[PDB]
Amino acid sequence: VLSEGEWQLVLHVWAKVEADVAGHGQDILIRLFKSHPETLEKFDRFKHLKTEAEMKASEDLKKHGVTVLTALGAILKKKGHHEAELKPLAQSHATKHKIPIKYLEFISEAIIHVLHSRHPGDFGADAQGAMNKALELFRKDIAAKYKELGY
Ligand code: HEM
Known part of the structure; x- marks a missing residue:
């Protein structure tokens, strides 16, 4: 559990992220795909991308990055009181998209x-x-729902 001071630090940087959500989302998904290429293959939308330049040039990747960071920001701003927000995300990520906790x-x-x-x-x-x-x-909280669901 995070202290109020820890949440303050988290949300202070997050408000900076929210000044350029799409650029952050591009940098984050690209970094993820380069560092851990098994993740790219989970995306039918993106698995055709073979170079970093192709990734940077994909508008649909940029759109999805906004979706990801918008969802994460909504979770972070709940400061742990995020049960409602995690329910559909765990369900799709466990049962539909098949994303491991790792x-x-x-x-x-x-x-x-x-x-x-x-x-x-x-x-x-x-x-x-x-x-x-x-x-x-x-x-921790997504994993507990993955466990409920047998994933
Ligand atoms: C911070 C962590 C993450 C957040 C907040 C997040 C959020 C989202 C959201 C909001 C959606 C659309 C609604 C839904 O289907 O639930 C989505 C879809 C999806 N996510 Fe995630 N996600 C995260 C991590 C991941 C990771 C690590 C992977 C893969 C390695 C992944 C794979 C997918 C896939 C395959 C879809 C469906 C994309 C499509 O074809 O349109 N997600 N995610």
């Missing part, structure tokens, strides 16, 4: 990496630790 770990690492690059003065160590706790909590 791949949620991979996108968490991509998020943290991109935040560090784009917002270093608001993403020093205290903030990094706070954000990692928030994304761990996100994973």
